[PDB]
């Protein structure tokens, strides 16, 4: 019974190999009290921190795909194995996922913790973009994995990766949550604390969408109330948002809204394709796969198709693949990979790691 | 009293959407400083780069988006094309000047080009050097002006392929541009000797001349205004671009003289007689500045500036007959990049959605006032004015 | 003769362009009687409400930079033009100031009132932080504008603003006034009414200061009476305060004193600089400009320099610019701007607004 | 006083004929503002763009030795004559440089601009590799000109060039700068904007070197801290780099690090020699001349000698000529050529061009 | 450390920000696991690393 753990910047998905959906999905946060106790646990991790967030200071151990605190990172993993999965980490091999172009130092620390702290029998690290392509049942395609910390575009052709064509965009769900916080102040709603960041994140996940034509949508929102929606705060107050529903996701296609010099996700995907060989660009155009929670906005696939088509030559067939379960594509692909019979040769034993070190982990991994 | 009375102080430029542009156009790479673009309410003409000879791309306004690399072009010249100008009285007639020392008049089919166009209607061979200046007569029918690098200005009759007038001993150096006046009886020209000249073509005499209008050695322009004044853009001794207003009855000192910046590139002025607004577009610049010419001093009022992040290689202005009146649009500029043509819409902000009488007075129509035979005799007539209210939707 | 009106949360400064100091400075309060009249004006605005505050209930029309009552907002403007300046608003163009990241709805209402209610011939709206840079004669710098409602940090480089790096702190003079009221109860003095709030505000403006080292100052005040000061109440009673002189301004650098999760003004200024481009942070470190009345505490500049120096790298030169006139920096910068010959092109005529609307005001303004 | 202008992809070197070093050396960049001006020049070229790069978007008019924008290219030339040299182009003949196998269309545009836009009296275009041989005082040898846009290998024997043996490598300093940016992310440093590209380029020019044995150097860097160096960012932050010092220049000898199928500079130089006749390969082996800024890495000459010696037969004497001033060898050779008495017959008059056209420029030039 | 192992020894008076290029005790070829000052000598410290060696400094 191998374990598949997909640890991201914002959410941590865990489960067992062979299952169709992750068993445990909880926020990757660690909360600590910020007041003084007066009536006769110094940290809360995951859902328990979300329920007590009114008196806690919520901090993300992973920021922009970089672990800013390894002490809190082990709390997420400890909460995963014992509290969420309720299993012994030393009795199940663990399949881990890593971001594309992951630094070797980051992989070494993750491997060291799994073998020395949790004493897992076997361990393996897989690329998130590759696992996303596993779920879709394809060997060729470019994966636009946009999550909470960073956005990546990874082209794969016939099972061969092209690291030189991998592009990174420092713009993901958390940056959109902060942008929604900024533009909500223009409507008179003030969210400032870390607890209110999770409230605004809930608003973004429920009311935000991507407009096919941004300027046309702004004109519609400025002359009608049809695009108006209401959200109820935890204390019973009801807030109302208008054009902010499609203005917040628009920063993905127009990063200049955040003061960023980089290009949008549509141009980043196009630029990654153009960095590949000419003979493989045709297959990448028709196999654009969306993954991550930040790609769950309604109408983001149609907008991506329209934007890429305007960039690609007219003779190419642009096809955006947006499966309904793409929020868990990395975990689902990892579950499929861990259940394959031809995968048991990729496991790395704890005994092998003890006598060889992290060198055997850099090999056998990409 | 606090704010100068004007209707165009808040005119803003807005480029059209991506799907409404013209891409994959190999714009010409000729160092000659011309507009590189001519647009009428029917077609869009852009000078393109050809491996052999010269050609320009004429495509319908509805043919937006990416343009096929094998799209038929008007390739009849044996040398690179320098200037193109649509006939004001015929939306399907365009004259082109090239480096082969010839001027050719073309007839474009209604639906565009299905095969490459090589045989023109009329070939004008009267210049010994390359022709980079072409200006149709505003009123007289089938009358065309061509000014080559031989410092010779020629008046042609397109209908009969006849050379009506020849003006040779009037320009001692290279001619920069030639612009007709309102009625078409006179034309002004800027020359390399920093001299503005007003010349009567039917009499071959020099009406008024201003020596050293701009002290700079960089290229300078001169255009005629509707009321009868000359607006010139030039450089100073300190290589500072300037705008000047000249009175043909008094040229000792300019009416106005304003300095814009110290950047390079000649300033191409685009005059709108209906609104009395001059759009100054410099070659290689990323900004469009519009000024209003009124009788109140300093006779040149800076309205605003449209700013972009891409330099322009050329620019053509859509006449009044092709603008969207219902959207309070007073000017459309087809900005030319190195591989793209991006229309830019100038819109007067107005709350009302009805027709704006003040913004759209009567404009010159596509019907000629006189003919070539009548104009030679000495007849002078104003352009026939039409109403833009019928264009409202 | 153009008018410059700098209307803030707590004070309203008005005058004429070209003058060195505002001619009319009065509190932005509207007072209404709370008792019944027994002997044979239902509202008082400004100084007249301050002289009769014993029988009035004082209300601030602006709270945290947000206008909570536009009917009272017009009373402040009407009192400014007719009672304070004693001029006809329809004969002078009016230059107005707005907070950074001002909502467009707030600007539309302010523009509508000036053109439709007061019929001003011309009007322009300027950013307060930019005007504060005009008074100091600089084009590059970060302005920490701390007033009565809110605190803002606006970095400007070579005349270019960076809206993405603009940070907001919901802590200003009024929050410090309420904190002084709370900690004065511990000394035995009870101030509860709105009239007594103005009394405590006078105590704050006269006896409070920022300590260079808070812990050392607290120890000094606990073993000596040298820091003790006396204040005379309007009715003749004399109150005496000790460590409350430097404890009240300390909430600016330690917002946890008010139960706030946000960081201090020193960290907000540092975080705003860090949000800018790396190549411009050097100029922002040496051009930190203090603006507003809240930055008038003695020793606040020295504490600001010491705190930022501990955050910035040792190779950076931290310079805090605290002009003695910074309480009126926004108005003085507006007076300078309104007198420039190159500014006359930025006026918006009343006739233009009638035929075009508020769209021409969103343009020409930043 | 003839002018010698050496325009490259990254840097522009200009000066007067007869001088021993270029008078003006500035980056070949054009910067445009990317923010909105709020305080009452739309482009910056050269050093003024480098000093304001924080609020500008820097763009190179020349990419891979190809002029991607002739409007910005004229800005570089205008900035050279008027702002850097402070001379009138119409009074001095100009000697220009062209890349080997330069397209005739590229030369025609350069000739047309100098004669029409700048009205130069005389003009001539020379091959950069030929000029680099002049500076070394040799008539026989193969020049490996590696600059910012492209790497060229040009064999010359007894003053006769062999165009059929000229090899091109699309790999130069700019590709190494981008590679350094990619591998710096593995250490936790994020450089994404065009302004940070110049910062990383400065790191490359100061801390990078070529290792004689790459495998041994990697082992040394993995077991010691002696190869660590520190770099101070403009904002005072200090970063440390280890094996990245010699990994970035290693892409020159191992282009597979960038995903490129082509061979290294050592093999490209060897392949160019083998394309020549057998009787001249002996002289080319002992006269390998290094030119350009990308050949200024410490230890690149020793590495080049070791690699070519392995490829070449044992009986051949391999000599790598790396003068200390090879960064300006093209300009130095041009100044030497323009100062020769016999070079005055190679000038092309403006009057001759006006009556003959670019045909006379294709002749008299190679 | 990027390569090998090292530990930072600085005087107690050297407070504040420490330079990134401050000299360290970098003699081990593997990461240092433990350090212990000599009780009878305030200038002698022993360190153990992953290279299976113990070094006294
Ligand atoms: N339905 C939704 N619509 C829009 N955004 C969503 C939705 N669901 C999740 N997200 C966003 O996705 C982000 C994280 O997605 P995910 O990829 O699962 O996390 P990670 O990248 O950490 O693995 C969150 O910041 C959240 O805001
Ligand atoms: N000398 C002073 N010392 C301390 N605080 C002061 C001083 N002068 C004014 N203040 C406080 O500064 C606050 C804001 O003043 P001001 O800048 O006029 O606010 P606004 O920005 O709303 O106009 C006031 O509430 C006042 O209490
Ligand atoms: N000391 C150095 N070490 C390594 N690279 C350098 C050095 N100096 C310059 N360079 C590189 O050389 C390139 C340009 O060099 P050069 O050939 O002189 O000009 P260009 O290539 O623009 O004609 C730059 O991209 C720069 O990165
Ligand atoms: Mg993920
Ligand atoms: Mg204020
Ligand atoms: Mg070079």
Residue D235 CA to residue C283 CA, distance in Å, equals 9
Closest ligand 3 atom to D176 CA: 27
The b-or-e profile of A310-348 (16+ CB within 10 A means b, else e) is bbbeeebebebbbeeebbbbbbbbbbbbbeeeebeebbb
Three-state SS at C352: helix
C68: left (phi over 0), alpha (psi -120 to 50) or beta: alpha
- DSSP bridge pairs for D161: D156
Closest alpha carbon to A172 in A269, A248, A272: A248
> Which tokens belong to C342?
């190159």
**What is the distance in angstroms between the Cα of D238 and the nearest Cα belonging to chain C?**
9
Residue C176 CA to residue C252 CA, distance in Å, equals 8
A218 touches chain C (CB under 8 A): no
Q: Which residues line ligand 3 (CB under 6 A)?
A: D 8-11, 147-148, 173-174, 177, 201, 204-205, 292-294, 296-297, 327
A357 touches chain D (CB under 8 A): no
Residue B6 CA to residue D128 CA, distance in Å, equals 58
Residue D212 CA to residue D220 CA, distance in Å, equals 13
Contact (CB, 8 A) for A8 and A149: yes
Residue B339 CA to residue B58 CA, distance in Å, equals 15
Cβ neighbours of A128 (radius 10 Å) = 25
According to DSSP, residue C90 is labeled G
On chain A, the residues whose CB falls within 8 A of the CB of D190 are 64, 170
DSSP per-residue letters across D250-319: HHHH-GGGGT--S--HHHHHHHHHHTS-HHHHHHHHTTEEEESGGG-STTHHHHHHHHHHHHS-TTS---
CA of A11 to the centre of ligand 1 (A): 8
Residue B345 CA to residue B339 CA, distance in Å, equals 20
State the virtual CA torsion across B302, B305, B311, B313 in degrees, nearest 10: -60
Contact (CB, 8 A) for D40 and C364: no
Nearest CA to ligand 2 atom 5: C205
- DSSP bridge pairs for D232: D238
Terminal-residue alpha carbon distance, chain E: 18
Question: Is B66 within 8 Å of A313 when comparing Cβ atoms?
Answer: yes
User: What helix, strand, coil percent values describe chain D, rounded to 5?
Assistant: 45, 20, 35
On chain D, the residues whose CB falls within 8 A of the CB of B263 are 41-43
CA of A70 to the centre of ligand 3 (A): 40
Interface of D with B (CB under 8 A): 32, 34, 41-43, 57, 68-72, 74-75, 78, 82, 90, 105, 109, 112-113, 116-117, 119
Residue B115 CA to residue D343 CA, distance in Å, equals 51
For residue C9 and ligand 2, the question of a CB distance below 6 A is answered with yes
**Alpha-helical regions (H) of chain A:** 47-51, 70-78, 104-112, 128-135, 173-184, 194-207, 214-223, 244-253, 265-274, 281-285, 300-311, 329-339, 350-356, 359-362
- Chain A CA closest to residue D196: A261
Residue C111 CA to residue C75 CA, distance in Å, equals 16
Contact (CB, 8 A) for D98 and D61: no
**What is the distance in angstroms between the Cα of B327 and the nearest Cα belonging to chain A?**
14
- Whether A and C touch, i.e. at least 3 CB pairs below 8 A, reads as yes
Question: Counting ligands in written order, which one lies closest to the CA of residue D149?
Answer: 3
Residue D112 CA to residue D361 CA, distance in Å, equals 10
User: Which of A99, A100, A103 best probes binding to D when mutated, by most D CB atoms within 10 angstroms?
Assistant: A103
Cβ neighbours of A246 (radius 10 Å) = 24
Residues 6 or more apart whose CB falls under 8 angstroms from that of A262 comprise: A169, A170, A171, A255, A268, D192, D193
- Chain D CA closest to residue A106: D186
Query: What does the radius of gyration of chain E's CA atoms come to, in whole angstroms?
Result: 12
Q: Determine the angle formed by the axes of helices A244-253 and A265-274, rounding to 10 degrees.
A: 20
Residue B47 CA to residue A73 CA, distance in Å, equals 62
For chain B, the farthest-separated pair of C-alpha atoms sits apart, in whole angstroms, at 60
For residue A8 and ligand 1, the question of a CB distance below 6 A is answered with yes
CA of residue A223 relative to chain centroid, distance: 36
- Whether B and E touch, i.e. at least 3 CB pairs below 8 A, reads as no
Residue C6 CA to residue A237 CA, distance in Å, equals 34
Question: Counting ligands in written order, which one lies closest to the CA of residue A127?
Answer: 4
> Which tokens belong to B351?
């709350």
**Alpha-helical regions (H) of C11-103:** 47-51, 70-78
The answer to whether the peptide bond before residue A356 is cis (omega within 30 degrees of 0) is no
Cβ neighbours of B206 (radius 10 Å) = 12
Q: Tokens 């002997």 sit at which residue?
A: C39
Neighbours of ion ligand 5 (CB under 5 A): C 8, 147
> Which tokens belong to C337?
């701007």
Residue D347 CA to residue D252 CA, distance in Å, equals 38
> Which tokens belong to D169?
């490598």
Chain B contact partners (≥3 CB pairs within 8 A) = A, C, D
Closest alpha carbon to B133 in B107, B108, B154, B112: B154
For chain C, the farthest-separated pair of C-alpha atoms sits apart, in whole angstroms, at 73
Distances (CA, A) of B203 to A362, B75, B388: 89, 36, 36
Chain E contact partners (≥3 CB pairs within 8 A) = C, D
State the virtual CA torsion across A251, A253, A257, A262 in degrees, nearest 10: 120
> Which tokens belong to D159?
């003053």
State the virtual CA torsion across D92, D94, D95, D97 in degrees, nearest 10: 150
Contact (CB, 8 A) for B124 and B156: yes
Residue D204 CA to residue D239 CA, distance in Å, equals 13
Residue D81 CA to residue D23 CA, distance in Å, equals 12
> Which tokens belong to B143?
């009358």
Contact (CB, 8 A) for A32 and A57: yes
Contact (CB, 8 A) for B370 and B379: yes
Contact (CB, 8 A) for C121 and C349: yes
Interface of C with E (CB under 8 A): 313-314
According to DSSP, residue A117 is labeled I
Terminal-residue alpha carbon distance, chain C: 24
Nearest CA to ligand 3 atom 15: D293
Residue D228 CA to residue D242 CA, distance in Å, equals 5
| Beta-carbon-side half-sphere exposure of residue A152 (alpha carbons within 13 Å) | 28
According to DSSP, residue D148 is labeled S
Distances (CA, A) of A256 to A250, A291, B27, C162, D59: 10, 23, 29, 11, 17
According to DSSP, residue A187 is labeled G
Residues 6 or more apart whose CB falls under 8 angstroms from that of B386 comprise: B321, B362, B363, B364, B365, B366
Cβ neighbours of C86 (radius 10 Å) = 9
Residues 6 or more apart whose CB falls under 8 angstroms from that of B41 comprise: B61, B91, B318, B319, B321, B322
C204: left (phi over 0), alpha (psi -120 to 50) or beta: alpha
CA of residue D230 relative to chain centroid, distance: 27
Residue D66 CA to residue D174 CA, distance in Å, equals 13
State the virtual CA torsion across B194, B196, B200, B201 in degrees, nearest 10: 40
CA of D60 to the centre of ligand 3 (A): 14
Residue A68 CA to residue D185 CA, distance in Å, equals 15
Three-state SS at B200: strand
Contact (CB, 8 A) for B220 and B232: yes
Q: Determine the angle formed by the axes of helices A173-184 and A244-253, rounding to 10 degrees.
A: 140
Phi, psi (degrees; rounded to nearest 5) at A259: 75, 20
For residue C294 and ligand 2, the question of a CB distance below 6 A is answered with yes
DSSP per-residue letters across C256-325: GGGT--S--HHHHHHHHHHTS-GGGHHHHHT-EEEESSGGGSTTHHHHHHHHHHHHS-TTS---EE--TT
Residues 6 or more apart whose CB falls under 8 angstroms from that of D100 comprise: D127, D128, D129, D145, D152, D154, D166, D168
Contact (CB, 8 A) for B367 and B381: no
Residues 6 or more apart whose CB falls under 8 angstroms from that of B124 comprise: B102, B103, B104, B105, B144, B146, B154, B156, B161, B163
Residue A147 CA to residue C237 CA, distance in Å, equals 64
Residue B61 CA to residue B21 CA, distance in Å, equals 10
Contact (CB, 8 A) for C308 and C284: no
Strand pairing report for A141-146 and A151-157:
antiparallel
Residue C352 CA to residue B5 CA, distance in Å, equals 9
Question: Counting ligands in written order, which one lies closest to the CA of residue D207?
Answer: 3
Cβ neighbours of A35 (radius 10 Å) = 11
Q: Tokens 């082209």 sit at which residue?
A: A155
Distances (CA, A) of B300 to A295, B243, B258, E40: 53, 9, 8, 90
For residue A292 and ligand 1, the question of a CB distance below 6 A is answered with yes
On chain D, the residues whose CB falls within 8 A of the CB of E19 are 238
> Which tokens belong to C71?
């009917």
Three-state SS at D165: helix
On chain A, the residues whose CB falls within 8 A of the CB of C259 are 35
Element (H, E) at B92: strand B90-98
| Beta-carbon-side half-sphere exposure of residue A302 (alpha carbons within 13 Å) | 9
Contact (CB, 8 A) for B269 and B279: yes
Residue D340 CA to residue D103 CA, distance in Å, equals 27
| Window C:93-112, CB contacts with A under 8 Å | 101, 103-105
Residue C156 CA to residue C151 CA, distance in Å, equals 16
Closest ligand 1 atom to A8 CA: 22
Element (H, E) at D65: none
Residues 6 or more apart whose CB falls under 8 angstroms from that of D343 comprise: D337
Closest alpha carbon to D281 in D266, D270, D265: D270
> Which tokens belong to D70?
């002739």
DSSP per-residue letters across C310-324: HHS-TTS---EE--T
Terminal-residue alpha carbon distance, chain A: 24
- DSSP bridge pairs for B209: B197
Residues 6 or more apart whose CB falls under 8 angstroms from that of D51 comprise: none
On chain C, the residues whose CB falls within 8 A of the CB of D33 are 160
> Which tokens belong to C84?
């304070």
Cβ neighbours of A146 (radius 10 Å) = 26
Element (H, E) at D132: helix D128-135
B301: left (phi over 0), alpha (psi -120 to 50) or beta: beta
Question: Counting ligands in written order, which one lies closest to the CA of residue A294?
Answer: 1
Nearest CB to E20; choose among D222, D240, D242: D240
Q: Tokens 């704010």 sit at which residue?
A: B3
For residue A326 and ligand 1, the question of a CB distance below 6 A is answered with no
Three-state SS at C361: helix
Residue C142 CA to residue C287 CA, distance in Å, equals 6
Contact (CB, 8 A) for C196 and C221: no
> Which tokens belong to B229?
């004044």
């Amino acid at each position: 019974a191998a374990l598949v753990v997909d640890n991201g910047s914002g959410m941590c998905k865990a489960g067992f190999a062979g299952d169709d959906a992750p068993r445990a999905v909880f926020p990757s946060i660690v909360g600590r009290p910020r007041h003084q106790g007066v009536m006769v646990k110094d940290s809360y991790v995951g859902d328990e921190a979300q329920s007590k967030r009114g008196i806690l200071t919520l901090k993300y151990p992973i920021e922009h795909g970089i672990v800013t605190n390894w002490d809190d990172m082990e709390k997420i993993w400890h909460h995963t194995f014992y509290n969420e999965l309720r299993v012994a980490p030393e009795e199940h091999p663990v399949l881990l996922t890593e971001a594309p172009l992951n630094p070797k130092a980051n992989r070494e620390k993750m491997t060291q913790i799994m073998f020395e702290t949790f004493n897992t029998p076997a361990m393996y690290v897989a690329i998130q973009a590759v696992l996303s392509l596993y779920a879709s049942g394809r060997t060729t395609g470019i994966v636009m994995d946009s999550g909470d910390g960073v956005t990546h575009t990874v082209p794969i052709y016939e099972g061969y990766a092209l690291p030189h064509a991998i592009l990174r965009l420092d713009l993901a769900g958390r940056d959109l949550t902060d942008y929604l916080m900024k533009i909500l102040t223009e409507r008179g709603y003030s969210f400032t604390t870390t607890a209110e960041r999770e409230i605004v994140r809930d608003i973004k996940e429920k009311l935000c969408y991507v407009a096919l034509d941004f300027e046309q949508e702004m004109a519609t929102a400025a002359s009608s109330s049809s695009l108006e929606k209401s959200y109820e705060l935890p204390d019973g107050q009801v807030i109302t948002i208008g054009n902010e529903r499609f203005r917040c996701p628009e920063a993905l296609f127009q990063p200049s809204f955040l003061g960023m010099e980089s290009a949008g996700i549509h141009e980043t995907t196009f630029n990654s394709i153009m960095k590949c060989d000419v003979d493989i660009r045709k297959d990448l155009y028709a196999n654009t796969v969306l993954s991550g929670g930040t790609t769950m906005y309604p109408g983001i696939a149609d907008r991506m198709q329209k934007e890429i088509t305007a960039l690609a030559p007219s003779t190419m067939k642009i096809k955006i693949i947006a499966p309904p379960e793409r929020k868990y594509s990395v975990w689902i692909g990892g579950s499929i990979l861990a259940s394959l019979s031809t995968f048991q040769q990729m496991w790395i034993s704890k005994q092998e790691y003890d006598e060889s070190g992290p060198s055997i982990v850099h090999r056998k991994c990409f | 009293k606090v704010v100068r009375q004007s209707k165009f102080r808040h005119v803003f430029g807005q480029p059209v959407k991506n799907d409404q542009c013209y891409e994959d156009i190999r714009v010409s790479r000729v160092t000659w400083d011309s507009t590189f673009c001519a647009v009428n309410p029917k077609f869009l003409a852009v000078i393109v780069e050809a491996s052999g000879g010269g050609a320009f791309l004429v495509l319908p306004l509805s043919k937006t988006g990416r343009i096929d690399k094998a799209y038929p072009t008007v390739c009849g010249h044996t040398g690179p094309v320098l200037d193109i100008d649509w006939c004001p009285h015929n939306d399907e007639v365009i004259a082109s000047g090239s480096e082969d020392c010839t001027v050719m008049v073309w007839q474009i089919p209604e639906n565009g080009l299905t095969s490459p166009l090589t045989e023109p209607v009329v070939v004008l061979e009267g210049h010994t050097k390359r022709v980079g200046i072409i200006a149709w007569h505003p009123t007289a029918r089938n009358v065309l002006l061509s000014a080559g690098c031989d410092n010779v200005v020629l008046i042609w009759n397109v209908g009969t392929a006849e050379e009506l007038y020849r003006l040779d001993s009037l320009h001692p150096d290279l001619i920069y541009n030639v612009s007709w006046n309102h009625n078409g009886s006179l034309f002004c020209s800027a020359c390399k000797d920093k001299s503005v000249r007003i010349i009567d073509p039917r009499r071959g005499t020099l009406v008024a001349e201003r020596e050293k209008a701009h002290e700079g050695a960089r290229p300078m322009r001169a255009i005629f205004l509707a009321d009868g004044k000359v607006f010139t853009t030039g450089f100073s001794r300190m290589s500072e671009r300037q705008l000047a207003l000249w009175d043909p009855e008094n040229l000792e000192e300019p009416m106005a003289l304003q300095e814009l910046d110290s950047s390079n590139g000649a300033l191409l002025p685009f005059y709108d007689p209906d609104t009395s607004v001059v759009y100054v577009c410099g070659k290689g610049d990323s900004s469009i500045r519009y000024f209003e010419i009124t009788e109140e001093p300093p006779y040149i009022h800076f309205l605003n500036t449209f700013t972009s992040k891409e330099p322009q290689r050329g620019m053509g202005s859509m006449p009044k007959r092709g603008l969207e009146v219902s959207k309070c649009e007073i000017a459309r500029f087809y900005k030319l990049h190195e591989r793209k043509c991006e229309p830019i819409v100038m819109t007067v902000p107005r709350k009302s959605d009805l027709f704006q009488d003040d913004l759209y007075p009567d404009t010159a129509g596509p019907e000629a006032a006189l003919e070539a035979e009548e104009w030679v005799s000495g007849r002078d007539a104003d352009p026939i004015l039409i109403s833009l209210r019928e264009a409202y939707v």
